[PDB]
Design an enzyme around this catalytic site. Structure first.
Site, PDB file in Angstrom:
ATOM      1  N   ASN A  37     -37.057 -56.667  27.651  1.00 51.82           N
ATOM      2  CA  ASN A  37     -37.908 -55.944  26.717  1.00 51.82           C
ATOM      3  C   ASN A  37     -38.484 -56.931  25.719  1.00 51.82           C
ATOM      4  O   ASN A  37     -37.824 -57.907  25.351  1.00 51.82           O
ATOM      5  CB  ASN A  37     -37.132 -54.849  25.948  1.00 51.82           C
ATOM      6  CG  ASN A  37     -36.499 -53.822  26.867  1.00 51.82           C
ATOM      7  OD1 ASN A  37     -37.158 -53.270  27.762  1.00 51.82           O
ATOM      8  ND2 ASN A  37     -35.197 -53.552  26.652  1.00 51.82           N
ATOM      9  N   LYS A  57     -41.026 -51.392  21.334  1.00 56.37           N
ATOM     10  CA  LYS A  57     -40.329 -51.993  22.465  1.00 56.37           C
ATOM     11  C   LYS A  57     -41.187 -51.850  23.707  1.00 56.37           C
ATOM     12  O   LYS A  57     -41.521 -50.728  24.105  1.00 56.37           O
ATOM     13  CB  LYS A  57     -38.979 -51.319  22.723  1.00 56.37           C
ATOM     14  CG  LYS A  57     -37.811 -51.937  22.010  1.00 56.37           C
ATOM     15  CD  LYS A  57     -36.490 -51.185  22.294  1.00 56.37           C
ATOM     16  CE  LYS A  57     -35.980 -51.448  23.695  1.00 56.37           C
ATOM     17  NZ  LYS A  57     -34.517 -51.139  23.795  1.00 56.37           N
ATOM     18  N   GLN A 118     -39.245 -45.539  14.523  1.00 57.11           N
ATOM     19  CA  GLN A 118     -39.067 -45.869  13.123  1.00 57.11           C
ATOM     20  C   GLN A 118     -38.353 -47.209  12.974  1.00 57.11           C
ATOM     21  O   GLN A 118     -37.378 -47.499  13.677  1.00 57.11           O
ATOM     22  CB  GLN A 118     -38.267 -44.761  12.451  1.00 57.11           C
ATOM     23  CG  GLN A 118     -37.602 -45.155  11.158  1.00 57.11           C
ATOM     24  CD  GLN A 118     -36.499 -44.185  10.786  1.00 57.11           C
ATOM     25  OE1 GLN A 118     -35.976 -43.449  11.643  1.00 57.11           O
ATOM     26  NE2 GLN A 118     -36.149 -44.162   9.499  1.00 57.11           N
ATOM     27  N   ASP A 119     -38.858 -48.039  12.068  1.00 59.68           N
ATOM     28  CA  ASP A 119     -38.156 -49.257  11.677  1.00 59.68           C
ATOM     29  C   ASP A 119     -37.098 -48.862  10.653  1.00 59.68           C
ATOM     30  O   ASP A 119     -37.419 -48.611   9.488  1.00 59.68           O
ATOM     31  CB  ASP A 119     -39.130 -50.285  11.112  1.00 59.68           C
ATOM     32  CG  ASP A 119     -38.430 -51.519  10.601  1.00 59.68           C
ATOM     33  OD1 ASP A 119     -37.217 -51.679  10.873  1.00 59.68           O
ATOM     34  OD2 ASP A 119     -39.090 -52.339   9.928  1.00 59.68           O
ATOM     35  N   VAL A 120     -35.827 -48.810  11.080  1.00 63.32           N
ATOM     36  CA  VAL A 120     -34.753 -48.337  10.205  1.00 63.32           C
ATOM     37  C   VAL A 120     -34.358 -49.449   9.237  1.00 63.32           C
ATOM     38  O   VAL A 120     -33.458 -49.271   8.409  1.00 63.32           O
ATOM     39  CB  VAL A 120     -33.526 -47.838  11.003  1.00 63.32           C
ATOM     40  CG1 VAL A 120     -33.922 -46.678  11.902  1.00 63.32           C
ATOM     41  CG2 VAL A 120     -32.883 -48.972  11.807  1.00 63.32           C
ATOM     42  N   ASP A 224     -24.902 -48.178  26.544  1.00 64.54           N
ATOM     43  CA  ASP A 224     -24.985 -49.596  26.190  1.00 64.54           C
ATOM     44  C   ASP A 224     -24.317 -49.819  24.830  1.00 64.54           C
ATOM     45  O   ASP A 224     -24.896 -50.371  23.901  1.00 64.54           O
ATOM     46  CB  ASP A 224     -26.437 -50.075  26.213  1.00 64.54           C
ATOM     47  CG  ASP A 224     -26.552 -51.573  26.478  1.00 64.54           C
ATOM     48  OD1 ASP A 224     -25.506 -52.237  26.668  1.00 64.54           O
ATOM     49  OD2 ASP A 224     -27.685 -52.097  26.474  1.00 64.54           O
ATOM     50  N   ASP A 249     -30.807 -48.800  21.363  1.00 65.15           N
ATOM     51  CA  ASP A 249     -30.910 -49.301  22.726  1.00 65.15           C
ATOM     52  C   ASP A 249     -30.332 -48.282  23.702  1.00 65.15           C
ATOM     53  O   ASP A 249     -29.305 -48.520  24.352  1.00 65.15           O
ATOM     54  CB  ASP A 249     -30.229 -50.671  22.849  1.00 65.15           C
ATOM     55  CG  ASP A 249     -30.712 -51.450  24.029  1.00 65.15           C
ATOM     56  OD1 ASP A 249     -31.545 -50.912  24.775  1.00 65.15           O
ATOM     57  OD2 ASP A 249     -30.261 -52.599  24.221  1.00 65.15           O
ATOM     58  N   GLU A 251     -31.817 -47.069  26.431  1.00 65.58           N
ATOM     59  CA  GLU A 251     -32.627 -47.031  27.640  1.00 65.58           C
ATOM     60  C   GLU A 251     -31.798 -46.820  28.902  1.00 65.58           C
ATOM     61  O   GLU A 251     -32.354 -46.427  29.933  1.00 65.58           O
ATOM     62  CB  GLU A 251     -33.470 -48.305  27.739  1.00 65.58           C
ATOM     63  CG  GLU A 251     -32.670 -49.595  27.796  1.00 65.58           C
ATOM     64  CD  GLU A 251     -33.552 -50.859  27.763  1.00 65.58           C
ATOM     65  OE1 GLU A 251     -34.743 -50.781  28.146  1.00 65.58           O
ATOM     66  OE2 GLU A 251     -33.053 -51.935  27.375  1.00 65.58           O
TER      67      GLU A 251
HETATM   68  N1  LIG Z   1     -35.641 -48.888  15.415  1.00 64.48           N
HETATM   69  C1  LIG Z   1     -35.352 -50.147  15.007  1.00 64.48           C
HETATM   70  N2  LIG Z   1     -35.310 -50.490  13.699  1.00 64.48           N
HETATM   71  C2  LIG Z   1     -35.038 -51.751  13.316  1.00 64.48           C
HETATM   72  N3  LIG Z   1     -34.774 -52.766  14.164  1.00 64.48           N
HETATM   73  C3  LIG Z   1     -34.784 -52.546  15.499  1.00 64.48           C
HETATM   74  C4  LIG Z   1     -35.083 -51.197  15.999  1.00 64.48           C
HETATM   75  N4  LIG Z   1     -35.019 -51.243  17.341  1.00 64.48           N
HETATM   76  C5  LIG Z   1     -34.720 -52.521  17.678  1.00 64.48           C
HETATM   77  N5  LIG Z   1     -34.579 -53.288  16.584  1.00 64.48           N
HETATM   78  C6  LIG Z   1     -34.275 -54.741  16.584  1.00 64.48           C
HETATM   79  O1  LIG Z   1     -34.453 -55.307  17.887  1.00 64.48           O
HETATM   80  C7  LIG Z   1     -33.200 -55.794  18.405  1.00 64.48           C
HETATM   81  C8  LIG Z   1     -33.115 -55.452  19.889  1.00 64.48           C
HETATM   82  O2  LIG Z   1     -33.223 -54.040  20.049  1.00 64.48           O
HETATM   83  P1  LIG Z   1     -32.668 -53.324  21.384  1.00 64.48           P
HETATM   84  O3  LIG Z   1     -33.164 -51.889  21.380  1.00 64.48           O
HETATM   85  O4  LIG Z   1     -31.189 -53.630  21.499  1.00 64.48           O
HETATM   86  O5  LIG Z   1     -33.498 -54.181  22.464  1.00 64.48           O
HETATM   87  P2  LIG Z   1     -32.961 -54.646  23.912  1.00 64.48           P
HETATM   88  O6  LIG Z   1     -33.003 -53.371  24.718  1.00 64.48           O
HETATM   89  O7  LIG Z   1     -34.002 -55.658  24.352  1.00 64.48           O
HETATM   90  O8  LIG Z   1     -31.595 -55.236  23.670  1.00 64.48           O
HETATM   91  C9  LIG Z   1     -32.152 -55.075  17.569  1.00 64.48           C
HETATM   92  O9  LIG Z   1     -30.888 -55.752  17.467  1.00 64.48           O
HETATM   93  C10 LIG Z   1     -32.830 -54.927  16.226  1.00 64.48           C
HETATM   94  O10 LIG Z   1     -32.847 -56.135  15.476  1.00 64.48           O
HETATM   95  N1  LIG Z   2     -27.537 -58.630  28.706  1.00 64.56           N
HETATM   96  C1  LIG Z   2     -28.164 -59.369  29.810  1.00 64.56           C
HETATM   97  C2  LIG Z   2     -28.013 -58.600  31.114  1.00 64.56           C
HETATM   98  C3  LIG Z   2     -29.146 -57.677  31.455  1.00 64.56           C
HETATM   99  C4  LIG Z   2     -30.160 -57.911  32.339  1.00 64.56           C
HETATM  100  N2  LIG Z   2     -30.997 -56.828  32.398  1.00 64.56           N
HETATM  101  C5  LIG Z   2     -30.542 -55.857  31.543  1.00 64.56           C
HETATM  102  C6  LIG Z   2     -31.057 -54.593  31.262  1.00 64.56           C
HETATM  103  C7  LIG Z   2     -30.391 -53.826  30.333  1.00 64.56           C
HETATM  104  C8  LIG Z   2     -29.229 -54.292  29.711  1.00 64.56           C
HETATM  105  C9  LIG Z   2     -28.714 -55.541  29.993  1.00 64.56           C
HETATM  106  C10 LIG Z   2     -29.376 -56.355  30.922  1.00 64.56           C
HETATM  107 MG   LIG Z   3     -29.924 -54.396  23.019  1.00 66.07          MG
HETATM  108 MG   LIG Z   4     -31.505 -52.547  26.141  1.00 64.92          MG
END
Ligand SMILES: Nc1ncnc2c1ncn2[C@@H]1O[C@H](COP(=O)(O)OP(=O)(O)O)[C@@H](O)[C@H]1O
Ligand SMILES: NCCc1c[nH]c2ccccc12
Ligand SMILES: [Mg+2]
Ligand SMILES: [Mg+2]
Ligand SMILES: [Ca+2]
EC number: 2.7.1.-
Length: 361
Positions: A37, A57, A118-120, A224, A249, A251
């Site tokens: 992402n 995202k 939303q940006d929390v 997750d 996260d 998804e």
């Molecule tokens: N709604 C949100 N508000 C503030 N920060 C966010 C938000 N969503 C994501 N982030 C930032 O992006 C980083 C990765 O988000 P995440 O949803 O875990 O992405 P990924 O699926 O790529 O791991 C988070 O640790 C945070 O810093």
């Molecule tokens: N955290 C690295 C592993 C990974 C690859 N593709 C993903 C998709 C969602 C969560 C983790 C992963």
């Molecule tokens: Mg993540």
């Molecule tokens: Mg993720």
């Protein structure tokens, strides 16, 4: 055709042209992390559904570093719908004090694979706090484990109760969420091999984990739940009071075994405790099991939680690059031994007896 959401300019064009947003181009920041992402923080000159700062995202169809690892972009509509469903049930999931929350979902765009929320706020993750020196205060770690355990037990309770509600049943069809777990389990054998472990029981273990995630309808799982997906909001000025926990996260949110969420978070607590701070990881694990067991209306399956923790240890230890090579190999072997305990004739395994002791009333 789609806009290019992997570049700053394409992101600004997408936001202004496709959504008619008023973008402060000096406040557009690429957020680190993510191999599948691309995440952006965007400041707006005018509010979008009441928010002047948003996160976008963008789901890619593969890993940026390995385009042969395929992951469907439709997971992004499950993340959007999941945080909508949590907001629609926030008063009960958030409990009597409302500490745990999720970001509000503002938009999902199908053809651009773009989710806006939303940006929390700019916040450190639980992972940052537990790897910082000195580590997260033990009082906060306990509260964090208590509040997350209560949230997850309430999520699992309502997932069972409303299993046939349409807005819940939707997540049984997150085929990307299920498939991604399948693909992650498939790394168990190579990760063990890397550390010099060729256990011919592992194919059988993996097949069971895969059949469960592909077919289980047990409950709604966040899917997750580790420290890298949890934000802590500490009091500004008072870095010793926890005000909010944000769980990010979603998804991979799907229907699945309850033990999947427990295996993620408790497995992360084991890595934390092993390699970062024993009291932090252990306090968090114990408070999570206490709170989860008390709030959950259903029996914990300790053998499956043992196997989940085992899978987490094998799947993640090398990725985290904590401790030394020798310590990681020993830790992975302990994870492999836990797999054998889960298929044993008895609850006397090291990890299983710890779960029972720490969850006890
Ligand atoms: N709604 C949100 N508000 C503030 N920060 C966010 C938000 N969503 C994501 N982030 C930032 O992006 C980083 C990765 O988000 P995440 O949803 O875990 O992405 P990924 O699926 O790529 O791991 C988070 O640790 C945070 O810093
Ligand atoms: N955290 C690295 C592993 C990974 C690859 N593709 C993903 C998709 C969602 C969560 C983790 C992963
Ligand atoms: Mg993540
Ligand atoms: Mg993720
Ligand atoms: Ca055995």
């Amino acid at each position: 055709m789609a806009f290019d959401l992997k570049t700053e300019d394409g992101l600004i064009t997408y936001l202004t042209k496709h959504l008619s947003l008023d973008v402060d181009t000096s406040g557009v920041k690429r957020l680190s992390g993510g191999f599948v992402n691309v995440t952006w923080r965007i400041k707006l000159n005018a509010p979008y559904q009441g928010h002047t700062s948003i996160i976008l995202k963008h789901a890619q169809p593969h890993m940026s570093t390995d385009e042969d690892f395929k992951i469907g972009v439709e997971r992004s509509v499950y993340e959007y719908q999941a945080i909508k469903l949590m907001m629609a049930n926030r008063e009960v999931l958030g409990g009597v004090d409302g500490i745990v929350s999720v970001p509000e979902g503002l938009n999902y765009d199908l053809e651009n694979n773009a989710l806006i929320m939303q940006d929390v706020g700019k916040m450190k993750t639980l992972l940052d706090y537990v790897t910082a020196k000195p580590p997260l205060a033990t009082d906060i770690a306990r509260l964090v484990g208590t509040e997350i355990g209560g949230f997850v037990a309430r999520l699992h309770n309502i997932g069972r109760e409303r299993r046939d509600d349409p807005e819940f049943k939707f997540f049984s069809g997150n085929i990307v969420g299920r498939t991604t777990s399948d693909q992650l389990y498939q790394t168990i054998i190579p990760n063990a091999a890397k550390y010099g472990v060729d256990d011919p029981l592992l194919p059988t273990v993996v097949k069971d984990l895969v059949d469960d995630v592909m077919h289980s309808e047990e409950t709604l799982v966040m899917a997750d739940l580790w420290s890298g997906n949890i934000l802590l909001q500490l009091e500004e000025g008072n870095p010793s009071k926890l005000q909010k926990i944000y769980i990010l996260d979603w998804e991979l949110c799907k229907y699945g075994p309850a033990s999947l969420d427990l295996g993620y978070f408790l497995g992360d607590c084991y890595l934390i405790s092993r390699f970062q701070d024993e009291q932090v990881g252990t306090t968090m694990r114990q408070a999570y099991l206490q709170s989860y067991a008390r709030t959950s209306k259903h029996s914990i399956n300790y053998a499956k939680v043992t196997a989940g923790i085992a899978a987490h240890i094998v799947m993640w230890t090398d990725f985290m690059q904590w401790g030394s090579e020798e310590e990681r190999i020993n830790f992975v072997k302990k994870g492999v031994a836990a797999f054998h305990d889960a298929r044993g004739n008895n609850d006397n395994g090291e990890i299983t007896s710890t779960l029972l002791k720490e969850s006890s009333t």
